[PDB]
Amino acid sequence: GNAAAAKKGSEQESVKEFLAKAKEDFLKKWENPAQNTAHLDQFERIKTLGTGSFGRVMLVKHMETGNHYAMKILDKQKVVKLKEIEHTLNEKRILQAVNFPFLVKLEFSFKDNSNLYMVMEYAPGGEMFSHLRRIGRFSEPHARFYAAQIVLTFEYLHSLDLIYRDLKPENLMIDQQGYIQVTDFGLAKRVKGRTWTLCGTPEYLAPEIILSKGYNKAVDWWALGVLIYEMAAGYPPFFADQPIQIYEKIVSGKVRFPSHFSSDLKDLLRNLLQVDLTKRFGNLKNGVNDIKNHKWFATTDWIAIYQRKVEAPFIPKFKGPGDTSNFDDYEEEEIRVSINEKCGKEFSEF
């Protein structure tokens, strides 16, 4: 009613001011990045919590404070070898500059002769991926709780000219309160106008990526649709054993919904999962507000989500600091640090 229009009116003005403030903060750090704020011998490495192409994330303990952190370690030589210097520089530069409730928190970064290191707040709830596969699927209220955090995070990143490009349950950490922290900024980029790199996870790729088109931040809104679908269904909308078969499904303009999906969910998803850019929610003239005002989100108090005052429909359990029961077990590997500096010029800004 009239109260709702007034409420919406003042909250939008308040988001615009928040965003302009957040862009000034970000730009200061983006243009003059922090470097070399810690060292390796100050941390006991406890457990590998995840791996990737050039390294791994470990639970570590900062010996001087006793605090637990998650430390990402990347092998400089592997990076150069696979020609991915720019992407790894992007990741660190962005992470050191952003600040938002649903992003991982970079506390320290440094490098030595062999590796790059990023020390971030430890999120003990594990990856959404693990709970999603175990449980099978999330209820619509559970999925919506998470989707709402993504919507605000993307509104925030996009207003900073950042494109994220790798949304998926694997890349969403759960904190102690059951809230999300987006990780894996390896494919994120600050861009004005179009970009062309073929990157992302097959199931989540927007059709304009697959079609070698040139693309923009609308790919993130498409990905949100895939994410919402997978959370609510237990499987993604487009899958197959060979990536080419996934891509053909993505570009066909066809999606089928489980019979248990609400009408409202199906409608949100048909609009997010639009092959036509000029028709995709998130990318029209009202932008993100078409998503925020869709009926599926009717129960969502956007400001209360931001302030983390909403009760999480699900919370992983944990027993004290440094517990890792919410993580899978990986093979461990001792960290050898070379006597000779490797790839020094390439990573000099890091």
Partner: peptide
């Protein structure tokens, strides 16, 4: 069912990104 087809697929583990 689609769920059975997913679970029987090679795509239920952690998915890698492409970058090439």
């Amino acid at each position: 069912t689609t769920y059975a087809d997913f679970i029987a697929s090679g795509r239920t583990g952690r998915r890698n990104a492409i970058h090439d």
